RNA sequence: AGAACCUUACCAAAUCUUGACAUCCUUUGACAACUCUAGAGAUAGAGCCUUCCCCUUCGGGGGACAAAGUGACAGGUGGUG
RNA sequence: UAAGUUGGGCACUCUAAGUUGACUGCCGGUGACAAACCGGAGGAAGGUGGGGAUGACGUCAAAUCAUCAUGCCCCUUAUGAUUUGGGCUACACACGUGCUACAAUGGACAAUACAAAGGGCAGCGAAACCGCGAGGUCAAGCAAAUCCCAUAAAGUUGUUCUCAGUUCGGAUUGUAGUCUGCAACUCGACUACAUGAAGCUGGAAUCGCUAGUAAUCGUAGAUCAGCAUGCUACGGUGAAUACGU
């Protein structure tokens, strides 16, 4: 039941960066993951120059799903914490699957595109919407 | 295993070690020398039913204390047999010894003594059941907080390995402030081996 | 690996020295597991005991890629159908 | 000068009693006895398989306690030597007198 | 069998390193401790017997 | 002047935190924190003592620390700072009890049990 | 290619070009950079007059055109010519030091 | 919780049969270190030395054995959880 | 003072043995008022703080006569045994475990930091010299909070490789050396060089993890004359997830 959450963050402005540094921490190594996410921060602040807070908030406010499934399938209301966690997990999954050249070009493109409410992020969003709305036959 | 001899866990907390000497990296020599005296103990075991011995190693001297079943002839009439035992031990262990015989607790309430008693009684073609009844009767007469004796193997001249237990009173095993005496013995007449483990619970 | 130079047994060497002083012999019963290739065994034959029966094998002139310790596997058929 | 000793027995009770009697005997005829300096008391490790023919994963843990106790006495005198050599009935202690 | 191994390890050896530290009371070839010259099970048997003054398990 | 003392013991890391007057800063082993502790931009947590305790008057820190990892050493500074703030005056003892970071965390690496491997993973199941 | 051997990738760094084919190899990188100075100035082929001045001499002793091929060919010729105490285990994939082959997949074997 | 030999229980060869080992009786006794030879090695022949060391009132015991005879035997990783 | 090497103290940490302490021991509410339940305060430990040994009756004709003993049957000039070779490990193979990569969170290069535990007397080899490295050689201290094994890796500080069967990758064999072993071939390990297959996260199925957790990266010990991708112990970074049966 307890979550053992972590409050502080090197960039105090957003606490989602705690989840970021935690999930990108694969293979037990933190320094390089934090370095590459800082690089993504810098590039997204550079490409289409704006504060990364607004583009990140657009990504974390447009790619949030409302339809999920929990041999029967039923749509279920999502808790906000689980919704944000799944969104960040999908963001890191897109970062892995894109497989681009530089450390952070994929990450910055992902966050910018999600802020645009277009791309594979919204493609997965509508996949969740239509897959769950197909399961509504068990709601009654 | 499911059940392990509790005196293994008991030692080091309330009770002392079976063998005691000074600490050094040359423990192999000390243990291999002590094994010879432990095997030699059987000579006094077969006639006096000594429960066990605590052996001590002084700066250059060895001190032992046997728990005999009766001190009269282990000490001799006036010391007619202790000197030859000391000499034999000195020859066998290649070092002298300081024998200090003490009689086991006056009541036959200890573990190894009664274990050997019932082992010999079984080997003498006596009903293990009646022997156990007598043993538990005198155990509760003498006064003990808890006593059980298990047996295993081919009892009563059979070919089936069965086990029995006959306990009495409160016998806390999982409890550590128990101060118990676990024993073991082996007995047979013509059929295999018949192991017995006598347990004594005297005071807490 | 290699120590004390080439490894020998110092008794097969006695037999080979005794049989090499005269005309060379083509029959030598031996075990040949603690010996190595060296130029003094040229022109001779050895019967290395693989474990069932020692089988003579003649020494060739190109003993750089072969060792006299083993000529055939002691695992007959090498424990396989093929 | 000073005289230091090192004690090794597998029971902290016998070592504590031995240190106490050694200190008392040394201070009986003199003074300036340094106390029972504690030392880290490293241990050992013995992993023993709790089986005979199978069951390697089921094991048992053993060890060997190695207790080190250092007591110093300054201004050495033969009286403290006699006090130290008085009696070592808990011979589990490994009396190693040094200077 | 091992009845001749108990003497073979005690008999002469062809060179310096030809023997193994087998158990003394036991004859178990494998899993022996060179510090005590006793096998795996013999150490446990005597430790349960309290012969060695060493401390008990469950001290960590 | 007066100098307070505190200590932090967590994750087998002990920091002998000594507090001195000044602008408010640290010298880990007479050295700066930024390069001694690798990738330690987390000093926001380390200065949270100044932002939440004793108004915002920063107090210089001298720390001699050995043992444990760099992150465990960093969190060990927090315990010593909090202890020094406690012993300065008991007024904020209750607030620190209500502000967190005062109850020492006894959570350290535990023992290794048989059944695990290089990855601390329990044995598998007899499948197929 | 032009420098030596058979073919060399174009617009690439020297450190991988010298190891693209049978040659000096990249494990000798420290030795070659200690002896010679021609290295990966940049990821493209910047071979100029200053370059190749002495790297060819430094690597000259390592004649790798068909030397490894002839060495291996003569080794296998001796293997299948002379008694094959190793040749018998060379069919099953066993080295001189042994492999204890149990998972004989279809890579080295038919 | 250590398979090159020893390791290992199997095969082949050199091989003995109270046997490789150990005890009980006696001829008795501090147990042979090193070399040459036949022998794949074992083992065997020897040169050589092991060699009352402790009590010894002179033996003897023990105490080891150098080899031998003796009836038991020892032995089985032969089997049976 | 390069450095706790030195004079000075045990101040801090740490260091081993006595003592308080988390025990429901207090408050409010709930609860048949009781037990008990919930929240709280104090409090490091709030509802047994965490981890480890202690595994009831018994079930499995579960395993061990091959630790040992063990009744019975058999060989006992062989079913006992001295010595030499191998063999338990062979491969059209399959199996399960474990190790290594499929990568650019990465690889490669250079400066740079944090740990505890264990063993050590002929063993642990200070410094140093040599060598292509393995390692060769000489050499300090130490029956151990002194000295050694022994450096912590990731990580911080800069660079390069730029998406390829890749500066990924080391399976494969060949050449020349090193430690130990009289002996490294069935049959140890390591090194310097070359060669460079598959594998670009894996289908149905499928295992593991609830907090200092997994995952990851290092260290020490036994096993050993030398040989650990196996085991144990120690240390570093360090997350979300349990709404609900």
Curated annotation (Swiss-Prot), chain A:
Keyword Ribonucleoprotein among record annotations: yes
InterPro entries, A to Z: Ribosomal_uS7 (IPR000235), Ribosomal_uS7_bac/org-type (IPR005717), Ribosomal_uS7_CS (IPR020606), Ribosomal_uS7_dom (IPR023798), Ribosomal_uS7_dom_sf (IPR036823)
Record bears the keyword Ribosomal protein: yes
GO molecular function, one term: structural constituent of ribosome
Keywords assigned: Ribonucleoprotein, Ribosomal protein, RNA-binding, rRNA-binding, tRNA-binding
Family matches, as Pfam families: Ribosomal_S7
GO process terms (BP): ribosomal small subunit assembly; translation
A GO cellular-component term linked to this record: cytosolic small ribosomal subunit
Family to which the UniProt record says this protein belongs: Belongs to the universal ribosomal protein uS7 family.
Functional summary from the UniProt entry: One of the primary rRNA binding proteins, it binds directly to 16S rRNA where it nucleates assembly of the head domain of the 30S subunit. Is located at the subunit interface close to the decoding center, probably blocks exit of the E-site tRNA.
Subunit structure: Part of the 30S ribosomal subunit. Contacts proteins S9 and S11.
Name by which UniProt lists this protein: Small ribosomal subunit protein uS7
Species of origin: Staphylococcus aureus (strain NCTC 8325 / PS 47)
Classification lineage: Bacteria, Bacillati, Bacillota, Bacilli, Bacillales
Gene coding for it: rpsG
UniProtKB/Swiss-Prot annotation, chain B:
Gene Ontology CC annotation, any one: cytosolic small ribosomal subunit
GO molecular function, one term: structural constituent of ribosome
Pfam families: KH_2, Ribosomal_S3_C
Domain KH type-2: 37-105
GO biological process: translation
Membrane-crossing residue ranges in chain numbering: none
Keywords: Ribonucleoprotein, Ribosomal protein, RNA-binding, rRNA-binding
InterPro entries: KH_dom, KH_dom-like_a/b, KH_dom_type_2, KH_sf_prok-type, Ribosomal_S3_C_sf, Ribosomal_uS3_bac-typ, Ribosomal_uS3_C, Ribosomal_uS3_CS
CDD domains membership: KH-II_30S_S3
Biological function: Binds the lower part of the 30S subunit head. Binds mRNA in the 70S ribosome, positioning it for translation.
HAMAP family registered for this protein in UniProt: Ribosomal_uS3_B
Classification via NCBIfam families: rpsC_bact
Complexes and interactors: Part of the 30S ribosomal subunit. Forms a tight complex with proteins S10 and S14.
Family per record: Belongs to the universal ribosomal protein uS3 family.
Protein name: Small ribosomal subunit protein uS3
Organism: Staphylococcus aureus (strain NCTC 8325 / PS 47)
Lineage of producing organism: Bacteria, Bacillati, Bacillota, Bacilli, Bacillales
Curated annotation (Swiss-Prot), chain C:
GO biological process: ribosomal small subunit assembly; translation
Pfam families named among the record's database cross-references: Ribosomal_S19
InterPro entries: Ribosomal_uS19 (IPR002222), Ribosomal_uS19_bac-type (IPR005732), Ribosomal_uS19_CS (IPR020934), Ribosomal_uS19_SF (IPR023575)
General function of this protein: Protein S19 forms a complex with S13 that binds strongly to the 16S ribosomal RNA.
Family named by the database record: Belongs to the universal ribosomal protein uS19 family.
Coiled coil: none
Name this polypeptide is given: Small ribosomal subunit protein uS19
GO CC aspect terms: cytoplasm; small ribosomal subunit
Domain of life: Bacteria
PROSITE patterns the UniProt entry points to: RIBOSOMAL_S19
Biological source species: Staphylococcus aureus (strain NCTC 8325 / PS 47)
One Gene Ontology term of the molecular function aspect: structural constituent of ribosome
Keywords: Ribonucleoprotein, Ribosomal protein, RNA-binding, rRNA-binding
Keyword rRNA-binding: yes
Encoding gene (name): rpsS
Classification lineage: Bacteria, Bacillati, Bacillota, Bacilli, Bacillales
Swiss-Prot record, chain G:
GO MF annotations, alphabetized: rRNA binding; structural constituent of ribosome; tRNA binding
Alphabetic keyword roster: Ribonucleoprotein, Ribosomal protein, RNA-binding, rRNA-binding, tRNA-binding
Subunit structure as annotated in this protein's UniProt entry: Part of the 30S ribosomal subunit. Forms a loose heterodimer with protein S19. Forms two bridges to the 50S subunit in the 70S ribosome.
One Gene Ontology term, aspect cellular component: small ribosomal subunit
Name of the featured protein: Small ribosomal subunit protein uS13
Entries under InterPro entries matching the protein: Rbsml_uS13_C, Ribosomal_uS13, Ribosomal_uS13-like_H2TH, Ribosomal_uS13_bac-type, Ribosomal_uS13_CS
Similarity comment: Belongs to the universal ribosomal protein uS13 family.
Described purpose of this protein according to its UniProt entry: Located at the top of the head of the 30S subunit, it contacts several helices of the 16S rRNA. In the 70S ribosome it contacts the 23S rRNA (bridge B1a) and protein L5 of the 50S subunit (bridge B1b), connecting the 2 subunits; these bridges are implicated in subunit movement. Contacts the tRNAs in the A and P-sites.
Keyword Cytoplasm: no
GO biological process, one term: translation
Keyword rRNA-binding: yes
Cystine crosslinks: none
Any one Pfam family match given in the protein's UniProt record, by short name: Ribosomal_S13
Top-level division of the source organism's lineage: Bacteria
Region (Disordered): 90-110
Species annotation: Staphylococcus aureus (strain NCTC 8325 / PS 47)
């Amino acid at each position: 039941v307890p979550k053992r959450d972590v409050l502080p963050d090197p960039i105090h402005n957003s606490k989602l960066v705690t989840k970021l540094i935690n999930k990108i921490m694969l293979d037990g190594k933190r320094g390089t993951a934090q370095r590459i996410l800082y690089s993504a921060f810098d590039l997204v602040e550079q490409r289409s120059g704006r504060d990364a807070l607004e583009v990140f908030e657009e990504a974390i406010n447009n790619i949030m799903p409302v339809l999920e499934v929990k041999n029967y399938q039923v749509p279920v209301e999502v808790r906000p914490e689980r919704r944000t966690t799944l969104g960040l997990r999908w963001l890191v999954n897109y970062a892995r699957l894109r497989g681009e050249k530089t450390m952070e070009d994929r990450l910055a493109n992902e966050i910018l595109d999600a802020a645009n409410n277009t791309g594979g992020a919204v493609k997965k969003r509508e996949d969740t919407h239509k897959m769950a709305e197909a399961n509504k036959a068990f709601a009654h | 295993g499911q059940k392990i001899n509790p005196i293994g866990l008991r030692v080091g907390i309330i009770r002392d070690w079976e063998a005691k000497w000074y600490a050094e990296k040359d423990f192999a020599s000390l243990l291999h020398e002590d094994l010879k005296i432990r095997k030699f103990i059987d000579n006094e075991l077969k006639e006096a039913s000594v429960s066990h011995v605590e052996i001590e190693r002084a700066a250059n001297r060895i001190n032992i204390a046997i728990h005999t079943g009766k001190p009269g002839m282990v000490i001799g009439k006036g010391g007619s047999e202790i000197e030859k035992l000391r000499n034999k031990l000195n020859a066998l262990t290649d070092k002298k010894v300081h024998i200090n015989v003490i009689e086991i607790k006056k009541v036959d309430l200890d573990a190894r003594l009664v274990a050997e008693n019932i082992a010999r009684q079984l080997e003498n073609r006596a009903s293990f059941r009646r022997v156990q009844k007598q043993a538990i009767t005198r155990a509760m007469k003498l006064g003990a907080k808890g006593i059980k004796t298990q047996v295993s193997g081919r009892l009563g001249g059979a070919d089936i390995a069965r086990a029995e237990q006959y306990s009495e009173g409160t016998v806390p095993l999982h409890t550590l402030r128990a101060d118990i005496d676990y024993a073991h013995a082996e007995a047979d007449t013509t059929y295999g081996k018949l192991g017995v483990k006598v347990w004594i619970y005297r005071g807490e | 690996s290699i120590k004390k130079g080439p490894f020998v047994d110092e008794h097969l060497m006695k037999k080979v020295e005794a049989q090499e002083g005269s005309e060379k012999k083509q029959v030598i019963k031996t075990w040949s597991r603690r010996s190595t290739i060296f130029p003094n065994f040229i022109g001779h034959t050895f019967a290395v005991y693989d474990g069932r029966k020692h089988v003579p094998v003649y020494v060739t002139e190109d003993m750089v890629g072969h060792k006299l310790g083993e000529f055939a596997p002691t695992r007959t058929f090498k424990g396989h159908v093929a | 000068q000073k005289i230091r000793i090192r004690l090794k027995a597998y029971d902290h009770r016998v070592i504590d009693q031995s240190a106490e009697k050694i200190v008392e005997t040394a201070k009986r005829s003199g003074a300036d006895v340094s106390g029972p300096i504690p030392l880290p008391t490293e241990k050992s490790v013995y992993t023993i398989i709790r089986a005979v023919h199978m069951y390697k994963d089921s094991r048992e843990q053993f060890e060997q306690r190695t207790h080190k106790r250092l007591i110093d006495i300054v201004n050495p005198t033969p009286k403290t030597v006699d006090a130290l050599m008085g009696l070592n009935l808990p011979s589990g202690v490994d009396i190693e007198i040094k200077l | 069998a091992k009845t001749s191994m108990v003497a073979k390890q005690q008999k002469k050896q062809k060179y310096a390193v030809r023997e193994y530290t087998r158990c003394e009371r036991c004859g178990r070839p494998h899993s022996v401790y060179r510090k005590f010259k006793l096998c795996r099970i013999c150490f446990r048997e005597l430790a349960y017997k309290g012969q060695i003054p060493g401390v008990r398990k469950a001290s960590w | 002047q007066v100098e307070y003392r505190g200590t932090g013991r967590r994750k087998n890391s002990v920091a002998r935190v000594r507090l001195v007057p000044g602008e408010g800063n640290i010298t880990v082993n007479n050295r700066d924190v930024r390069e001694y502790l690798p990738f330690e931009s987390l000093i926001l947590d380390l200065n949270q003592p100044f932002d939440v305790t004793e108004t915002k008057g920063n107090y210089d820190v001298l720390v001699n620390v050995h043992g444990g990892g760099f992150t465990g050493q960093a969190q060990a500074i927090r315990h010593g700072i909090a202890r020094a703030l406690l012993e300065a005056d008991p007024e904020y003892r209750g607030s620190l009890k209500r502000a967190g970071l005062l109850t020492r965390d006894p959570r350290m690496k535990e023992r290794k049990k048989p059944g695990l491997k290089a990855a601390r993973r329990s044995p598998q199941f007899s499948k197929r | 290619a032009r420098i030596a051997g058979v073919d060399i990738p174009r617009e690439k760094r020297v450190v991988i070009s010298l190891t693209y084919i049978y040659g000096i190899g990249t494990s000798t990188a420290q030795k070659i950079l200690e002896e010679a100075n021609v290295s990966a100035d940049t990821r493209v082929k910047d071979l100029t007059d200053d370059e190749l001045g002495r790297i060819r001499e430094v690597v000259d002793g390592y004649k790798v055109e068909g030397d490894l091929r002839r060495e291996t060919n003569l080794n296998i010729k001796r293997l299948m010519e002379i008694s094959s105490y190793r040749g018998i285990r060379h069919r099953r994939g066993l080295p001189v030091r042994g492999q204890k082959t149990k998972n004989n997949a279809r890579t080295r074997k038919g």
